[PDB]
Chains A and B, each alone.
Chain A
Amino acid sequence: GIVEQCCTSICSLYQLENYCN
C-alpha cells in the first residue's frame, strides 16, 4: 500500500497521485 511505497521506501509524485480522488 501507500505506507510501503512512500514510508518504508522513497515516495514519488506518480505514486502519491494514485491516492487522490
Chain B
Amino acid sequence: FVNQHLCGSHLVEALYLVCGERGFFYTPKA
C-alpha cells in the first residue's frame, strides 16, 4: 500500500487514501 514505489496515478491514490478530508497537494516537478 504505502511502503513501495508509488508513481503516477498510484501515488495520487495513496495521497488520497492517507490524507482523507484534509486533502493534499501533488507537485510532480519540484
Query: Footprint of B on A, CB under 8 Å?
Result: 1-3, 6-13, 16-17, 19-21
Contact = CB atoms under 8 A, between A and B. Distances in A.
B4 A11 contact: yes
Interface of B: 2-8, 11, 14-15, 18-20, 22-30
Given A1-B29, A6-B5, A7-B11, 12 more contacts: A1-B28, A2-B11, A2-B30, A6-B7, A7-B5, A7-B7, A12-B3, A13-B18, A16-B2, A19-B19, A20-B18, A20-B22
Contacts of B14: 6, 11, 16
A12 B5 contact: no
Given A1-B27, A7-B6, A12-B2, A17 B11 contact: no
